[PDB]
Amino acid sequence: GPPTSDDIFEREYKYGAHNYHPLPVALERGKGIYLWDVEGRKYFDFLSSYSAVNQGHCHPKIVNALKSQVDKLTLTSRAFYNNVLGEYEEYITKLFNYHKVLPMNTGVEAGETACKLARKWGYTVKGIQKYKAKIVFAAGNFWGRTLSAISSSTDPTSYDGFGPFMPGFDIIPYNDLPALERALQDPNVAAFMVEPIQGEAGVVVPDPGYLMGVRELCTRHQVLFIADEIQTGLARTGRWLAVDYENVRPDIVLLGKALSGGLYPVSAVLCDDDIMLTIKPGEHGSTYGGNPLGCRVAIAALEVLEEENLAENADKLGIILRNELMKLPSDVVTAVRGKGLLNAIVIKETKDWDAWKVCLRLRDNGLLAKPTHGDIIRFAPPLVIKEDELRESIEIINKTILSF
Amino acid sequence: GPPTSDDIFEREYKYGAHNYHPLPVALERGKGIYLWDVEGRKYFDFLSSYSAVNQGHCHPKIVNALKSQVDKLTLTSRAFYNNVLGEYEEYITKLFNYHKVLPMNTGVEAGETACKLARKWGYTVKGIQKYKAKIVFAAGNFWGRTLSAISSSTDPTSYDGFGPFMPGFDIIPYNDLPALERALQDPNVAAFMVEPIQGEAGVVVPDPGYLMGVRELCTRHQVLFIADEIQTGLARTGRWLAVDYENVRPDIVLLGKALSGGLYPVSAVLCDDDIMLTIKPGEHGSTYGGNPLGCRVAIAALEVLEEENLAENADKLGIILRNELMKLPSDVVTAVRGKGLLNAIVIKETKDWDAWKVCLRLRDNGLLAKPTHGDIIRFAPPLVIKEDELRESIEIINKTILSF
Ligand SMILES: Cc1ncc(COP(=O)(O)O)c(CNc2cc(F)cc(C(=O)O)c2)c1O
Ligand SMILES: Cc1ncc(COP(=O)(O)O)c(CNc2cc(F)cc(C(=O)O)c2)c1O
């Protein structure tokens, strides 16, 4: 017969690396806001694969683009041109109003690309001596698992045991304009990379005016503002980009995750010519970056977010979600935070009761969510969810929280 | 009407980064050994997207796996289990006889993973003090474009303008056992990473006995042998792994590219428990690593290489290819090298005549190949090619080389 859930956990234990400890649920099917496990149980997805399935699981329009293009051509490499990449490049640069895009595959590769752009612009345009360029990051950041990405982390689970670390990366507190102003006094700083809302730090929303103040200070001191929108971008917070809430234009914008609707790893680095063209032919890229299959998928994924007005839906339904979550007793849920459909609750963790136990019981009651920190639970369902579906989910959350 | 080739080049010039200078040909369809451009011209593919389409373009079995799984589920993230990943993990670990695999997406991420494994094993098993671990690489190496990967490169096009660089990376000559023996005297060395045949250095095949000597020296000095088989693995050289030619077992094996038949970025890191399990839950991973769509594709891609005996075909036809290429006059083609269907010629470059011009004319005559170094041309067609097709391709190469 087909493997049970326990079989599935045990087989991965034997033959796969132990780099994750997932919540014990074994899915085999996803459609829209729902997931089904191998026993046939149905769940609400309140993680959305960290924003990658904003459009819902297996969105038919995005599937159709994949199935149409896989019959024509999937990979030429960049040794030649394929016919899809320029159509995608025109579409996304016009959509976000930047001169150019550099295509990559995973979110961390977009971050690496942005660090390379910042350094090469710092040396060739700003006039920093080679190799004294610095990049500033905010404590709590997470942008992936390469040696460079963990070198900017303050999370020991990211960096401990994996050094020595990349030089030239400085760290300041998040949501702290005086600290950024102090860091940018060094003319060897080339850029500041920052998430408009910190995802893995626990959905940390900075104070109103932070993003405008970051833009003002970067401009004043001739520093590039890199906005990592790999989780916050593409409608998840209720705008096309979370920086749109303060009408702020970063110098470099990073996209990923929902760029493909979860059907393909596609990421993107957006900026104008004065930054982009510091990288010359032969100096950067990726085997799969800009391949025609990912590009057809990304065009469709972007079209879905536009045609279905998913940013408006995320905004309106996020307000319902936070308002209803705030009714839970303060002695058990100590904070509700978020924008759009990127939200989190904080739990009054005890000796025995923690975020992991809440998420186990949420799973028992038909809802899938992921803990972090032991007292933080993310709530981020796909943006195609409807109000009726949202309210049923909240009832699952209430039932679970109040069952303890 | 539909864009012409020139239209396609111009649109990418306007809206995409200038990080590549591709050969001027604009493809829209691929099937098996062939590619078609937007004018309907048919070409032999003699690049195979740097080994990623070993199985030929759009292999029907691999397409079928993609189309079947995209209807069920494509991405849960590793916050939960999907049902496909363990089936893939069992298959590939049994196929290559290692305890475990760690799934990632791109080749450079597999390399980053291996560096993290080597460092964490060096600290926790070998007893190196944090953070003094070193990794040795061979001059000429290429394993991608992250800040760490360019820090081990000796190619200025990879690293110039992008420092400062990752510490702890030492470089020795390729194909040089005395130099490796000298480097491994430092007990803070944790690993040696090496390609069994250097791809982007120009298909540099080391001398017989090199890989055995590397294995012997690594074992003697308690150093991990990391074999980067992202281009050489998966039948391209006429064995499952290029290290099979000397019956050598690395400690860590890196796979990528052909792992998906070009339909999806899938990469893999293979090693035994004493190395793999130095990474604990929460310390490494990737959003898309091990997603169920890539895994179904990778299972099918691996099955194709086995069922169709593509390593045997690559071996037998590689010998024909090198033998026929060696008939070209020595004054124009100064070297022929390779194993299996990973081969290159070296050209007697002049003031006016170079590898780029040869490849332009090869394209005119129906064959697509890529230059490197100005005097090196790669010849690497998909492994499903037949002898009759191979001989027609050689006739295109002869016609072109002898037309100058
Ligand atoms: C031996 C070995 N190991 C790892 C990697 C990284 O694989 P990946 O690209 O998935 O990160 C590569 C990449 N090969 C390659 C060769 C080339 F001529 C151009 C490109 C390009 O980027 O356009 C890439 C590799 O050759
Ligand atoms: C803001 C931001 N920027 C870049 C990246 C890198 O994206 P990528 O994974 O494609 O390289 C991420 C990754 N998010 C994330 C969150 C999480 F809880 C687990 C994982 C995991 O790896 O399992 C990944 C990111 O949150």
mmCIF file of N, CA, C and O in Angstrom, chain A residues 14 17-20 23 25 27 30 49 67 71-72 74-76 79 81 83 100-101 106 109 112 116 119 123 130-131 145 147 160-164 260 262 281-282 284 286 288, chain B residues 14 17-20 23 25 27 30 49 67 71-72 74-76 79 81 83 100-101 106 109 112 116 119 123 130-131 145 147 160-164 260 262 281-282 284 286 288:
data_model
loop_
_atom_site.group_PDB
_atom_site.id
_atom_site.type_symbol
_atom_site.label_atom_id
_atom_site.label_comp_id
_atom_site.label_asym_id
_atom_site.label_seq_id
_atom_site.Cartn_x
_atom_site.Cartn_y
_atom_site.Cartn_z
ATOM 1 N N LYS A 14 15.969 8.253 7.550
ATOM 2 C CA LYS A 14 17.026 7.314 7.163
ATOM 3 C C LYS A 14 17.899 7.874 6.046
ATOM 4 O O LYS A 14 19.134 7.768 6.114
ATOM 5 N N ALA A 17 19.431 14.313 4.929
ATOM 6 C CA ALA A 17 20.066 15.140 5.974
ATOM 7 C C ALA A 17 19.052 15.584 7.030
ATOM 8 O O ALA A 17 17.837 15.679 6.786
ATOM 9 N N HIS A 18 19.569 15.834 8.225
ATOM 10 C CA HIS A 18 18.737 16.226 9.363
ATOM 11 C C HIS A 18 18.788 17.740 9.569
ATOM 12 O O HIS A 18 18.879 18.251 10.690
ATOM 13 N N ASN A 19 18.718 18.491 8.480
ATOM 14 C CA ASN A 19 18.832 19.934 8.596
ATOM 15 C C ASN A 19 17.500 20.619 8.897
ATOM 16 O O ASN A 19 17.506 21.839 9.140
ATOM 17 N N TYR A 20 16.395 19.875 8.909
ATOM 18 C CA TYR A 20 15.113 20.439 9.310
ATOM 19 C C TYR A 20 14.469 19.527 10.323
ATOM 20 O O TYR A 20 14.730 18.332 10.353
ATOM 21 N N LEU A 23 7.206 20.291 11.170
ATOM 22 C CA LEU A 23 5.984 19.862 11.845
ATOM 23 C C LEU A 23 5.549 18.521 11.267
ATOM 24 O O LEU A 23 5.582 18.347 10.041
ATOM 25 N N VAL A 25 3.458 16.468 9.588
ATOM 26 C CA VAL A 25 2.333 16.346 8.674
ATOM 27 C C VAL A 25 2.906 16.088 7.281
ATOM 28 O O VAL A 25 3.879 16.725 6.870
ATOM 29 N N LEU A 27 2.180 16.002 3.388
ATOM 30 C CA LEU A 27 1.236 16.432 2.369
ATOM 31 C C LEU A 27 1.515 15.791 1.020
ATOM 32 O O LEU A 27 2.676 15.584 0.628
ATOM 33 N N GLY A 30 -2.060 19.910 -2.983
ATOM 34 C CA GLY A 30 -2.382 21.279 -2.643
ATOM 35 C C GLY A 30 -3.233 21.928 -3.717
ATOM 36 O O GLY A 30 -2.970 21.770 -4.911
ATOM 37 N N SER A 49 4.204 28.600 2.265
ATOM 38 C CA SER A 49 5.587 28.303 1.849
ATOM 39 C C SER A 49 6.449 29.567 1.879
ATOM 40 O O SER A 49 7.239 29.838 0.965
ATOM 41 N N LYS A 67 2.884 24.055 -18.324
ATOM 42 C CA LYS A 67 2.635 22.921 -19.203
ATOM 43 C C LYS A 67 2.772 23.311 -20.669
ATOM 44 O O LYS A 67 3.185 22.483 -21.498
ATOM 45 N N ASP A 71 6.601 21.940 -23.168
ATOM 46 C CA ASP A 71 6.559 21.265 -24.463
ATOM 47 C C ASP A 71 7.413 21.954 -25.519
ATOM 48 O O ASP A 71 7.695 21.351 -26.560
ATOM 49 N N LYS A 72 7.819 23.203 -25.301
ATOM 50 C CA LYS A 72 8.565 23.918 -26.325
ATOM 51 C C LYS A 72 10.059 23.942 -26.044
ATOM 52 O O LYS A 72 10.859 23.625 -26.923
ATOM 53 N N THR A 74 12.982 24.295 -22.352
ATOM 54 C CA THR A 74 13.092 24.618 -20.932
ATOM 55 C C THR A 74 14.419 25.240 -20.539
ATOM 56 O O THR A 74 14.454 26.038 -19.589
ATOM 57 N N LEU A 75 15.492 24.946 -21.247
ATOM 58 C CA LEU A 75 16.793 25.455 -20.807
ATOM 59 C C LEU A 75 17.753 25.486 -21.972
ATOM 60 O O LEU A 75 18.089 24.424 -22.499
ATOM 61 N N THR A 76 18.235 26.679 -22.336
ATOM 62 C CA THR A 76 19.322 26.793 -23.312
ATOM 63 C C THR A 76 20.664 27.089 -22.675
ATOM 64 O O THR A 76 21.710 26.815 -23.305
ATOM 65 N N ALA A 79 24.531 30.807 -22.712
ATOM 66 C CA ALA A 79 25.460 30.842 -23.829
ATOM 67 C C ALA A 79 24.773 31.289 -25.117
ATOM 68 O O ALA A 79 25.452 31.674 -26.079
ATOM 69 N N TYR A 81 20.610 32.940 -26.597
ATOM 70 C CA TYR A 81 19.354 33.600 -26.257
ATOM 71 C C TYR A 81 18.195 32.627 -26.396
ATOM 72 O O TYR A 81 18.144 31.839 -27.350
ATOM 73 N N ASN A 83 13.764 32.882 -26.432
ATOM 74 C CA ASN A 83 12.866 33.943 -26.855
ATOM 75 C C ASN A 83 11.995 34.505 -25.749
ATOM 76 O O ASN A 83 11.373 35.551 -25.962
ATOM 77 N N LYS A 100 16.077 47.883 -15.413
ATOM 78 C CA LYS A 100 16.588 46.575 -15.788
ATOM 79 C C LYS A 100 16.384 45.573 -14.657
ATOM 80 O O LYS A 100 16.283 45.928 -13.487
ATOM 81 N N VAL A 101 16.402 44.306 -15.027
ATOM 82 C CA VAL A 101 16.359 43.202 -14.081
ATOM 83 C C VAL A 101 17.507 42.245 -14.379
ATOM 84 O O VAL A 101 17.893 42.045 -15.545
ATOM 85 N N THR A 106 17.174 31.445 -6.815
ATOM 86 C CA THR A 106 16.731 31.406 -5.425
ATOM 87 C C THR A 106 16.885 32.782 -4.775
ATOM 88 O O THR A 106 17.540 33.688 -5.295
ATOM 89 N N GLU A 109 20.394 33.840 -3.940
ATOM 90 C CA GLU A 109 21.188 34.271 -5.085
ATOM 91 C C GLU A 109 20.874 35.709 -5.455
ATOM 92 O O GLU A 109 21.773 36.447 -5.887
ATOM 93 N N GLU A 112 22.917 37.663 -2.988
ATOM 94 C CA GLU A 112 24.327 37.651 -3.387
ATOM 95 C C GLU A 112 24.577 38.601 -4.551
ATOM 96 O O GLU A 112 25.576 39.367 -4.549
ATOM 97 N N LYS A 116 27.061 41.892 -4.716
ATOM 98 C CA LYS A 116 28.046 42.071 -5.786
ATOM 99 C C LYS A 116 27.809 43.386 -6.521
ATOM 100 O O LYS A 116 28.769 44.116 -6.815
ATOM 101 N N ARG A 119 28.982 46.245 -4.142
ATOM 102 C CA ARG A 119 30.431 46.360 -4.106
ATOM 103 C C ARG A 119 31.011 46.941 -5.405
ATOM 104 O O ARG A 119 31.843 47.870 -5.373
ATOM 105 N N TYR A 123 33.054 50.445 -5.862
ATOM 106 C CA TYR A 123 34.425 50.631 -6.357
ATOM 107 C C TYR A 123 34.448 51.475 -7.619
ATOM 108 O O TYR A 123 35.266 52.394 -7.745
ATOM 109 N N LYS A 130 39.680 49.431 -3.722
ATOM 110 C CA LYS A 130 39.535 47.969 -3.606
ATOM 111 C C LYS A 130 40.442 47.436 -2.502
ATOM 112 O O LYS A 130 41.627 47.779 -2.479
ATOM 113 N N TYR A 131 39.916 46.586 -1.591
ATOM 114 C CA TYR A 131 38.549 46.046 -1.414
ATOM 115 C C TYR A 131 37.984 46.477 -0.054
ATOM 116 O O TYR A 131 37.726 45.637 0.850
ATOM 117 N N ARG A 145 21.124 30.969 3.196
ATOM 118 C CA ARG A 145 22.013 30.038 3.886
ATOM 119 C C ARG A 145 23.401 29.919 3.285
ATOM 120 O O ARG A 145 24.164 29.061 3.725
ATOM 121 N N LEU A 147 27.401 31.057 2.733
ATOM 122 C CA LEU A 147 28.364 31.593 3.715
ATOM 123 C C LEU A 147 28.241 33.105 3.838
ATOM 124 O O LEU A 147 28.347 33.631 4.949
ATOM 125 N N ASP A 160 26.750 29.680 13.683
ATOM 126 C CA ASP A 160 27.655 28.965 14.580
ATOM 127 C C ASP A 160 28.148 27.664 13.949
ATOM 128 O O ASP A 160 27.365 26.858 13.434
ATOM 129 N N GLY A 161 29.464 27.483 13.959
ATOM 130 C CA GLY A 161 30.077 26.305 13.370
ATOM 131 C C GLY A 161 30.402 26.403 11.897
ATOM 132 O O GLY A 161 30.900 25.443 11.328
ATOM 133 N N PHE A 162 30.174 27.552 11.242
ATOM 134 C CA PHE A 162 30.309 27.603 9.793
ATOM 135 C C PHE A 162 31.272 28.670 9.344
ATOM 136 O O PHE A 162 31.425 28.875 8.122
ATOM 137 N N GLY A 163 31.956 29.358 10.285
ATOM 138 C CA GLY A 163 32.938 30.353 9.866
ATOM 139 C C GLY A 163 34.257 29.724 9.389
ATOM 140 O O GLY A 163 34.437 28.493 9.359
ATOM 141 N N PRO A 164 35.219 30.575 9.030
ATOM 142 C CA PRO A 164 35.243 32.038 9.227
ATOM 143 C C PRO A 164 34.334 32.761 8.270
ATOM 144 O O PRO A 164 33.885 32.251 7.230
ATOM 145 N N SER A 260 7.008 32.965 -8.744
ATOM 146 C CA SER A 260 6.693 31.766 -9.524
ATOM 147 C C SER A 260 5.406 31.076 -9.114
ATOM 148 O O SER A 260 5.069 30.003 -9.673
ATOM 149 N N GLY A 262 5.197 29.329 -6.646
ATOM 150 C CA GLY A 262 5.647 28.078 -6.075
ATOM 151 C C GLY A 262 5.928 26.981 -7.088
ATOM 152 O O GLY A 262 6.250 25.851 -6.679
ATOM 153 N N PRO A 281 29.768 41.948 -19.189
ATOM 154 C CA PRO A 281 29.576 40.575 -19.676
ATOM 155 C C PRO A 281 30.631 39.608 -19.150
ATOM 156 O O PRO A 281 31.845 39.881 -19.158
ATOM 157 N N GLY A 282 30.162 38.461 -18.680
ATOM 158 C CA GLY A 282 31.098 37.445 -18.206
ATOM 159 C C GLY A 282 31.412 37.513 -16.727
ATOM 160 O O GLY A 282 32.189 36.678 -16.244
ATOM 161 N N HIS A 284 28.971 37.712 -14.087
ATOM 162 C CA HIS A 284 27.980 37.246 -13.121
ATOM 163 C C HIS A 284 26.921 36.452 -13.849
ATOM 164 O O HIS A 284 26.679 36.657 -15.048
ATOM 165 N N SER A 286 24.364 32.572 -13.647
ATOM 166 C CA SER A 286 23.781 31.367 -13.084
ATOM 167 C C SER A 286 23.392 30.438 -14.234
ATOM 168 O O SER A 286 22.904 30.915 -15.255
ATOM 169 N N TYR A 288 20.793 28.356 -14.437
ATOM 170 C CA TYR A 288 19.363 28.336 -14.697
ATOM 171 C C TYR A 288 18.739 29.724 -14.709
ATOM 172 O O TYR A 288 17.551 29.840 -15.095
ATOM 173 N N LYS B 14 17.866 46.242 -23.814
ATOM 174 C CA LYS B 14 17.191 47.373 -23.171
ATOM 175 C C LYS B 14 16.796 47.054 -21.735
ATOM 176 O O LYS B 14 17.003 47.885 -20.837
ATOM 177 N N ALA B 17 19.992 42.994 -17.450
ATOM 178 C CA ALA B 17 21.414 43.202 -17.116
ATOM 179 C C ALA B 17 22.331 42.709 -18.237
ATOM 180 O O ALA B 17 21.983 41.828 -19.042
ATOM 181 N N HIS B 18 23.510 43.313 -18.296
ATOM 182 C CA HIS B 18 24.493 42.997 -19.333
ATOM 183 C C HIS B 18 25.558 42.045 -18.791
ATOM 184 O O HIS B 18 26.760 42.184 -19.047
ATOM 185 N N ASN B 19 25.134 41.044 -18.034
ATOM 186 C CA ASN B 19 26.097 40.144 -17.427
ATOM 187 C C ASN B 19 26.507 38.995 -18.346
ATOM 188 O O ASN B 19 27.420 38.237 -17.973
ATOM 189 N N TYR B 20 25.883 38.869 -19.517
ATOM 190 C CA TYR B 20 26.307 37.873 -20.493
ATOM 191 C C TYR B 20 26.454 38.534 -21.840
ATOM 192 O O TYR B 20 25.816 39.540 -22.122
ATOM 193 N N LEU B 23 26.302 34.039 -27.654
ATOM 194 C CA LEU B 23 26.366 33.885 -29.106
ATOM 195 C C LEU B 23 25.041 34.340 -29.706
ATOM 196 O O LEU B 23 23.979 33.996 -29.170
ATOM 197 N N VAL B 25 22.140 33.881 -31.373
ATOM 198 C CA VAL B 25 21.152 32.940 -31.875
ATOM 199 C C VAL B 25 20.002 32.908 -30.868
ATOM 200 O O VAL B 25 20.225 32.873 -29.654
ATOM 201 N N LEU B 27 16.759 30.996 -29.634
ATOM 202 C CA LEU B 27 16.047 29.733 -29.725
ATOM 203 C C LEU B 27 14.654 29.813 -29.122
ATOM 204 O O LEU B 27 14.426 30.489 -28.104
ATOM 205 N N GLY B 30 13.312 23.220 -28.413
ATOM 206 C CA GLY B 30 14.334 22.202 -28.285
ATOM 207 C C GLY B 30 13.724 20.818 -28.190
ATOM 208 O O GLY B 30 12.736 20.612 -27.481
ATOM 209 N N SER B 49 23.679 22.899 -22.518
ATOM 210 C CA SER B 49 23.418 23.761 -21.351
ATOM 211 C C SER B 49 24.339 23.395 -20.185
ATOM 212 O O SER B 49 23.919 23.310 -19.024
ATOM 213 N N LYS B 67 4.552 17.154 -15.630
ATOM 214 C CA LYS B 67 3.146 17.455 -15.859
ATOM 215 C C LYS B 67 2.246 16.682 -14.904
ATOM 216 O O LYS B 67 1.176 17.179 -14.515
ATOM 217 N N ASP B 71 0.138 18.918 -11.253
ATOM 218 C CA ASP B 71 -1.288 18.854 -10.940
ATOM 219 C C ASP B 71 -1.563 18.457 -9.496
ATOM 220 O O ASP B 71 -2.689 18.635 -9.021
ATOM 221 N N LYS B 72 -0.582 17.906 -8.785
ATOM 222 C CA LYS B 72 -0.834 17.439 -7.431
ATOM 223 C C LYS B 72 -0.338 18.418 -6.378
ATOM 224 O O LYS B 72 -1.077 18.765 -5.458
ATOM 225 N N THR B 74 3.289 21.361 -5.681
ATOM 226 C CA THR B 74 4.617 21.761 -6.138
ATOM 227 C C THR B 74 5.526 22.265 -5.032
ATOM 228 O O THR B 74 6.752 22.102 -5.138
ATOM 229 N N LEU B 75 4.983 22.825 -3.969
ATOM 230 C CA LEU B 75 5.858 23.411 -2.952
ATOM 231 C C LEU B 75 5.126 23.496 -1.632
ATOM 232 O O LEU B 75 4.143 24.231 -1.540
ATOM 233 N N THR B 76 5.630 22.798 -0.609
ATOM 234 C CA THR B 76 5.119 22.974 0.754
ATOM 235 C C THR B 76 6.030 23.812 1.626
ATOM 236 O O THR B 76 5.556 24.374 2.638
ATOM 237 N N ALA B 79 8.877 23.473 6.161
ATOM 238 C CA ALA B 79 8.180 23.555 7.434
ATOM 239 C C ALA B 79 7.311 22.324 7.679
ATOM 240 O O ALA B 79 6.900 22.074 8.821
ATOM 241 N N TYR B 81 6.393 18.116 5.755
ATOM 242 C CA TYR B 81 6.832 17.045 4.867
ATOM 243 C C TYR B 81 5.944 16.988 3.636
ATOM 244 O O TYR B 81 4.718 17.134 3.733
ATOM 245 N N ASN B 83 5.291 14.175 0.265
ATOM 246 C CA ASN B 83 5.428 12.731 0.178
ATOM 247 C C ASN B 83 6.479 12.260 -0.808
ATOM 248 O O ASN B 83 6.821 11.072 -0.783
ATOM 249 N N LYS B 100 23.241 9.371 2.822
ATOM 250 C CA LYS B 100 22.262 10.444 2.883
ATOM 251 C C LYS B 100 22.524 11.475 1.791
ATOM 252 O O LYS B 100 23.638 11.629 1.299
ATOM 253 N N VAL B 101 21.486 12.229 1.478
ATOM 254 C CA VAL B 101 21.571 13.354 0.560
ATOM 255 C C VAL B 101 20.971 14.587 1.226
ATOM 256 O O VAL B 101 20.002 14.494 2.001
ATOM 257 N N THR B 106 20.482 24.973 -6.890
ATOM 258 C CA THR B 106 21.476 25.289 -7.911
ATOM 259 C C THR B 106 22.827 24.671 -7.552
ATOM 260 O O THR B 106 23.069 24.216 -6.432
ATOM 261 N N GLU B 109 24.725 26.334 -4.765
ATOM 262 C CA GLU B 109 24.217 26.047 -3.427
ATOM 263 C C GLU B 109 24.721 24.704 -2.930
ATOM 264 O O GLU B 109 24.975 24.546 -1.727
ATOM 265 N N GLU B 112 28.176 25.517 -1.713
ATOM 266 C CA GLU B 112 28.101 26.201 -0.420
ATOM 267 C C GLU B 112 27.791 25.220 0.704
ATOM 268 O O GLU B 112 28.420 25.274 1.792
ATOM 269 N N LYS B 116 30.042 24.312 4.041
ATOM 270 C CA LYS B 116 29.477 24.345 5.393
ATOM 271 C C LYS B 116 29.635 22.990 6.074
ATOM 272 O O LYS B 116 30.003 22.929 7.259
ATOM 273 N N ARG B 119 33.403 22.618 7.007
ATOM 274 C CA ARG B 119 33.754 23.409 8.176
ATOM 275 C C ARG B 119 33.175 22.828 9.477
ATOM 276 O O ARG B 119 33.896 22.680 10.484
ATOM 277 N N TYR B 123 35.245 21.394 12.689
ATOM 278 C CA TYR B 123 35.205 21.878 14.076
ATOM 279 C C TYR B 123 34.715 20.799 15.025
ATOM 280 O O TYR B 123 35.302 20.587 16.092
ATOM 281 N N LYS B 130 37.490 26.872 16.492
ATOM 282 C CA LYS B 130 36.691 27.859 15.744
ATOM 283 C C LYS B 130 37.403 29.208 15.726
ATOM 284 O O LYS B 130 37.832 29.676 16.783
ATOM 285 N N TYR B 131 37.526 29.855 14.544
ATOM 286 C CA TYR B 131 37.107 29.496 13.170
ATOM 287 C C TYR B 131 38.333 29.397 12.254
ATOM 288 O O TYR B 131 38.503 30.194 11.290
ATOM 289 N N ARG B 145 28.773 31.609 -8.699
ATOM 290 C CA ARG B 145 28.921 33.062 -8.694
ATOM 291 C C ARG B 145 28.620 33.728 -7.365
ATOM 292 O O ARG B 145 28.593 34.957 -7.313
ATOM 293 N N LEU B 147 29.558 35.075 -3.504
ATOM 294 C CA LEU B 147 30.817 35.658 -2.997
ATOM 295 C C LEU B 147 31.786 34.571 -2.553
ATOM 296 O O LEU B 147 32.990 34.705 -2.787
ATOM 297 N N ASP B 160 37.251 39.996 -9.736
ATOM 298 C CA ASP B 160 37.692 41.388 -9.731
ATOM 299 C C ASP B 160 36.513 42.344 -9.560
ATOM 300 O O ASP B 160 35.494 42.243 -10.253
ATOM 301 N N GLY B 161 36.644 43.253 -8.600
ATOM 302 C CA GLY B 161 35.591 44.210 -8.306
ATOM 303 C C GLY B 161 34.545 43.749 -7.316
ATOM 304 O O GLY B 161 33.617 44.493 -7.036
ATOM 305 N N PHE B 162 34.669 42.548 -6.730
ATOM 306 C CA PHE B 162 33.583 42.018 -5.919
ATOM 307 C C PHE B 162 34.029 41.660 -4.526
ATOM 308 O O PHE B 162 33.214 41.122 -3.748
ATOM 309 N N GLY B 163 35.296 41.955 -4.159
ATOM 310 C CA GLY B 163 35.726 41.670 -2.794
ATOM 311 C C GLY B 163 35.210 42.702 -1.780
ATOM 312 O O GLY B 163 34.489 43.662 -2.112
ATOM 313 N N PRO B 164 35.599 42.532 -0.516
ATOM 314 C CA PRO B 164 36.623 41.596 -0.010
ATOM 315 C C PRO B 164 36.138 40.172 0.013
ATOM 316 O O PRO B 164 34.939 39.852 -0.051
ATOM 317 N N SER B 260 18.083 17.129 -13.380
ATOM 318 C CA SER B 260 16.706 17.476 -13.734
ATOM 319 C C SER B 260 16.395 17.362 -15.214
ATOM 320 O O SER B 260 15.262 17.696 -15.641
ATOM 321 N N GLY B 262 17.268 19.444 -17.237
ATOM 322 C CA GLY B 262 17.057 20.815 -17.649
ATOM 323 C C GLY B 262 15.659 21.350 -17.383
ATOM 324 O O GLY B 262 15.370 22.497 -17.770
ATOM 325 N N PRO B 281 19.154 20.140 13.033
ATOM 326 C CA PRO B 281 17.925 20.797 12.568
ATOM 327 C C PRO B 281 17.952 22.310 12.767
ATOM 328 O O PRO B 281 18.319 22.832 13.835
ATOM 329 N N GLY B 282 17.562 23.024 11.721
ATOM 330 C CA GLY B 282 17.498 24.478 11.832
ATOM 331 C C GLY B 282 18.757 25.202 11.407
ATOM 332 O O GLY B 282 18.780 26.439 11.459
ATOM 333 N N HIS B 284 20.526 24.665 8.316
ATOM 334 C CA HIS B 284 20.838 24.789 6.896
ATOM 335 C C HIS B 284 19.610 24.433 6.091
ATOM 336 O O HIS B 284 18.745 23.670 6.548
ATOM 337 N N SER B 286 17.028 25.726 2.446
ATOM 338 C CA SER B 286 16.656 26.451 1.243
ATOM 339 C C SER B 286 15.133 26.417 1.113
ATOM 340 O O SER B 286 14.527 25.389 1.399
ATOM 341 N N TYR B 288 13.287 26.263 -1.662
ATOM 342 C CA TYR B 288 12.821 25.328 -2.674
ATOM 343 C C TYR B 288 13.523 23.979 -2.610
ATOM 344 O O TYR B 288 13.080 23.043 -3.316
#
